[PDB]
Design a binder for this molecule. Structure first.
Ligand SMILES: Nc1ncnc2c1ncn2[C@@H]1O[C@H](COP(=O)(O)OP(=O)(O)O)[C@@H](O)[C@H]1O
Ligand SMILES: Nc1ncnc2c1ncn2[C@@H]1O[C@H](COP(=O)(O)OP(=O)(O)O)[C@@H](O)[C@H]1O
Lengths: 252, 252
């Protein structure tokens, strides 16, 4: 079976903000035999899957794939990891969905969540979904998460205008496996691109591949000193780096 | 029943010093069908009532009502609250009243309180009263409070020249519900208007509506630093703010 050359890419940062658009470059797209708007299927770590509409861009390489933080966290991968891509031409429109909120997120929210949040989200935008994911909607000076529990053409479909939604039930608990989305990441840092590039390349090898430094005698850098006027967000950059590499973070 | 548009106003600061004059603007006054000098009836928090002569002014909005600190404290409301207004054309002259002092206020006062204090107060000024209120008279380098206990056309009337007063009895105790009137308020701060406006708008939302900051993620200001030469009354301003919002005050 052929899997190495047509079906391998490397995750990196995103430029678009939609939680379903995955951006890649045109040579890979006519190599994969995929056109714009076609729903694609991604497999990552721990046999997790995701369905996403595709899009083309130019400011990419021929092995890099740009995905948003929600879809990336939905596959359990981190930046610099590899995934598998496939065409999925057998998705159908749904006829029944059931969604729940996360209790950690809904606090002091009064009224009904349906007509304020889930009504403008699935409005005039055909969005694909798979059972057991988590998506995020922003508004009312808050950001609320939602977990899909069921799907009528199980286990994945596309949201069509005539797809009823039964938003019935009580909040569900966040388990000890997925991480929160109110945490810090590289997307929550405006400006300062060159310095971010430097720090990212400076801690890439010791924190991503730790076993490599048992096979070579080479000393990686261990002392970093950030400086600048107060109010420039340095602890932010620290927590960001520490969260995106999955490393442990202690604060003195 | 119609109550929202003709019978709702918002309390604010006063410009006059009389304990019976309540000031409002001419559009609301000819909307309520009220003329000058007519006794008006106010209902506030905890089904408290008050009878007051009315007056017109121009430096107001069309939903703000200016009342003195005595009448405001008599309704249990604070600044920025809402009250109900009504016309009360069925007040009559009294024929017997009975008033007592507050023991916390009378200290070292010798002689009789009647002819020195209660004689010039109800002199050539028709003043309305209701049973169970508290009013304040100034003189002799002191300020003495008085509580009405009974009224002959019960439970409210107007003081006419031929209304006898039986100032008979012993001092009464201040209970644990009403606050004193020798405390600090915005009226006891001369000058410094712009800075007062700034500090009042800076602590309005967190201290008046605390539940609102469980429904939005927005950080209110928490650090304030007052400065100026010594002798400019800064702790005064602090106690003032803390008393007018009803907040707890700790002093280090
Ligand atoms: N470049 C930036 N991008 C995003 N937010 C920033 C940036 N610079 C400052 N801030 C914001 O202002 C504050 C500045 O960071 P700082 O007060 O030094 O860190 P912290 O209080 O989190 O230890 C943070 O709350 C952050 O939200
Ligand atoms: N603007 C003002 N309005 C009213 N009284 C003031 C003003 N400025 C100063 N004072 C008076 O002078 C004193 C100045 O305040 P201060 O001596 O700093 O506070 P305290 O002695 O109460 O700790 C107070 O007793 C106050 O009565």
């Amino acid at each position: 079976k052929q899997k190495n050359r047509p079906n391998r890419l490397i995750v990196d940062e995103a430029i678009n903000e939609d939680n379903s658009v995955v951006s890649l470059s045109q040579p890979k797209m006519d190599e994969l035999q995929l056109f714009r708007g076609d729903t694609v299927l991604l497999k990552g770590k721990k046999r997790r899957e995701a369905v996403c509409i595709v899009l083309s861009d130019d400011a990419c390489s021929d092995e890099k794939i740009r995905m948003n933080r929600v879809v990336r966290n939905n596959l359990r991968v981190r930046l610099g990891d590899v995934i598998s891509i496939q065409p999925c031409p057998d998705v159908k429109y749904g006829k029944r969905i059931h969604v729940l909120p996360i209790d950690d997120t809904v606090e002091g929210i009064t009224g009904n969540l349906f007509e304020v949040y889930l009504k403008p989200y699935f409005l005039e935008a055909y969005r694909p979904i798979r059972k057991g994911d988590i998506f995020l909607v922003r508004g009312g000076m808050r950001a609320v998460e939602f977990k899909v529990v069921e799907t009528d053409p199980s286990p994945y479909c596309i949201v069509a205008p005539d797809t009823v939604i039964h938003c019935e039930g009580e909040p569900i608990k966040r388990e000890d496996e997925e991480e929160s989305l109110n945490e810090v990441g590289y997307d929550d840092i405006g400006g300062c691109r060159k310095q971010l590039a430097q720090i990212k390349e400076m801690v890439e090898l010791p924190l991503r591949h730790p076993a490599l430094f048992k096979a070579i005698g080479v000393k990686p850098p261990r002392g970093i000193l950030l400086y600048g006027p107060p109010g420039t967000g340095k602890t932010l950059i620290a927590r960001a780096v520490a969260n995106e590499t999955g490393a442990f973070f202690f604060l003195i």
